């Protein structure tokens, strides 16, 4: 009677003391979601620098990434669980305009549009990696394949003046056209609540973790600035 009540309170105090230590670790870590178009080469990006999870730390900051391979369907009912993540990483193979496999770039664009316009992912940014740049450069330098045959809008495109090519002008024009194809979808739907950070990625890059770190820093800083009515 009297002794039982005190016994219960003893166990509650021990449990509540453990939950305080767990809250410190939980609030100091950042969660990322990794997506792909099906044959985009996202496995290599993970390898170099049900559900698969990985942990890494840069500049004494803890990150923790999620990859889903146990579920493969055109309907993503589980996508509503990832509405508290810091950012989403989207990997797309940019050198697959001619591969019907209806081509894979159009499917990737449709997937990006579906993810962007979602009732739950309305405040989440996307870090976009445009993988397989060397293959794209080689195929563009090859005269046989023409993007305008598959993408008719390419017949009336010019390289932007405010560009930073390294490179023959043809491959730069192709890369910027492909990047703009995603940017035009990104800009229209959202208004300041989230942004997109496109990057050009290859199989020999080792600075991708720095890019993720900087993009997350920008995401949090912009979130705070918008919250304090300064942006």
């Amino acid at each position: 009677q009297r002794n039982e009540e005190k016994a219960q309170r003893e166990a509650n105090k021990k449990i509540e003391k453990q939950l305080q230590k767990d809250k410190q670790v939980y609030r100091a870590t950042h969660r990322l979601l990794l997506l792909g178009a099906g044959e985009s080469g996202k496995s290599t990006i993970v390898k170099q620098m049900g559900i698969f999870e990985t942990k890494f730390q840069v500049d004494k900051v803890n990150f923790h990434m999620f990859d889903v391979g146990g579920q493969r369907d055109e309907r993503r009912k589980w996508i509503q669980c990832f509405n508290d993540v810091t950012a989403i990483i989207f990997v797309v193979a940019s050198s697959s305009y001619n591969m019907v496999i209806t081509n894979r770039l159009q499917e990737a664009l449709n997937l990006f549009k579906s993810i962007w316009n979602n009732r739950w992912l309305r405040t989440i940014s996307v870090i976009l990696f445009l993988n397989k740049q060397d293959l794209l450069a080689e195929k563009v330098l090859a005269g046989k394949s023409k993007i305008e045959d598959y993408f008719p809008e390419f017949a009336r495109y010019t390289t932007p003046e405010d560009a930073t090519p390294e490179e023959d002008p043809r491959v730069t024009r192709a890369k910027y056209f492909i990047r703009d194809e995603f940017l035009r979808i990104s800009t229209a739907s959202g208004d300041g609540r989230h942004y997109c950070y496109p990057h050009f990625t290859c199989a020999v890059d080792t600075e991708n973790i720095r890019r993720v770190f900087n993009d997350c820093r920008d995401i949090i800083q912009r979130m705070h600035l918008r919250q304090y009515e300064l942006l």
């Binding site: 009540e5 219960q8 309170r9 166990a11 509650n12 449990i15 509540e16 453990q18 939950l19 767990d22 809250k23 939980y26 049900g50 559900i51 889903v68 146990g70 579920q71 369907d73 309907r75 009912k77 589980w78 669980c81 508290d84």
Partner: protein, 331 residues
């Protein structure tokens, strides 16, 4: 040729149940007295979860309950004195369901890792792990201490043998993800609602579907048995609830309002089956009248979306959980 016969067979089934609609449930219960107005108040508030809450299950003793959260904990509460009894950390932080054994010795869990885990409360360490599903688990219910039924996102359900960890039987026939299930009071039949807007009635012992109901328009999110056991109710994300009768093999009544446009996350019945409690996407719960289809109360004490709801076996309290990491007891 074969497809022609299936269309012909589906034609007579609609005609078979069309001649059985002598009247509607609404006409018969027009002379019944209204329930009136029902107002409830919060009695307890449970705190301690660091993230949003997906699952909740009452105990058979109507005193203890379990809850699951995205931060990776499985906390057992004491609803009377508001005291934490256990806190089981999980290997995977993505959890979608939980269950509490009728005897009170075990607790199950599952989620995005396609695995169901059983814990031994009275010994707390992992006892068994069940594998074989190719999709995320959506629900799980205990039949006994040695057998459990699970549903997953690979459009299949299964019955497991905990002692050996093997699927005794498998139920197939759905075309979309199975979202929920509920067992009969006698533990001989169960129903499942899937994303193809259809519900099915199965047989645990034999293992084949008996009847199919296709009244809804979109994905079915919740399902529950009538206390009698001859009827059940469903809830989809088109802001409608429907009541289906097993012996008549069709739909009896629809619960909807013109001021509601959000989806429905959970449903449950009262002790007598007169009241129907459903949780919505618009941050609050509503209370209906099963025999008349009119609103009788509103529970609006939550700050984020209500994801789970349950009623005690003795029917003294109602517990709800939401995405703001809080549980509330309404009496």
């Amino acid at each position: 040729q074969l497809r022609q016969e299936a269309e012909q067979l589906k034609n007579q089934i609609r005609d078979a149940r069309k001649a059985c609609a002598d009247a509607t449930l609404s006409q018969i219960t027009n002379n019944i007295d209204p329930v009136g107005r029902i107002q409830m108040r919060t009695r307890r508030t449970l705190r301690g979860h660091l993230a949003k809450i997906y699952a909740m299950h009452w105990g058979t003793d109507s005193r203890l309950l379990v809850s699951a959260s995205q931060d990776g904990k499985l906390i057992i509460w004491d609803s009377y004195t508001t005291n934490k009894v256990h806190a089981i950390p999980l290997r995977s932080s993505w959890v979608m369901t939980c269950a509490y054994a009728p005897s009170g010795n075990y607790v199950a869990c599952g989620g995005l890792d396609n695995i169901c885990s059983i814990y031994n409360l009275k010994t707390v360490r992992v006892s068994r792990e069940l594998a074989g599903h190719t999709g995320y688990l959506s629900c799980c219910r205990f039949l006994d201490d040695n057998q459990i039924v699970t549903s997953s996102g690979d459009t299949t359900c299964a019955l497991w043998d905990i002692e050996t960890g093997q699927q005794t039987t498998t139920f197939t026939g759905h075309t979309g993800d199975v979202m929920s299930l509920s067992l009969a009071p006698d533990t001989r039949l169960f129903v499942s609602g899937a994303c193809d807007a259809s519900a099915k009635l199965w047989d645990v012992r034999e293992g084949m579907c008996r009847q199919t109901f296709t009244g809804h328009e979109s994905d079915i999110n919740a399902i529950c048995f009538f206390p009698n056991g001859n009827a059940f109710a469903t809830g989809s994300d088109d802001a409608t609830c429907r009541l289906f009768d097993l012996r008549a093999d069709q739909e009896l009544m629809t619960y909807s309002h013109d001021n509601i446009i959000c989806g429905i996350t959970s449903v449950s019945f009262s002790k007598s089956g007169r009241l129907l409690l459903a949780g919505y996407d618009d941050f609050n719960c509503n209370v209906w009248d099963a025999l008349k289809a009119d609103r009788a109360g509103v529970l609006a004490g939550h700050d984020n979306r209500v994801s789970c709801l349950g009623v005690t076996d003795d029917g003294m309290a109602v517990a709800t959980g939401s995405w703001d990491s809080f549980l509330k007891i309404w009496n």
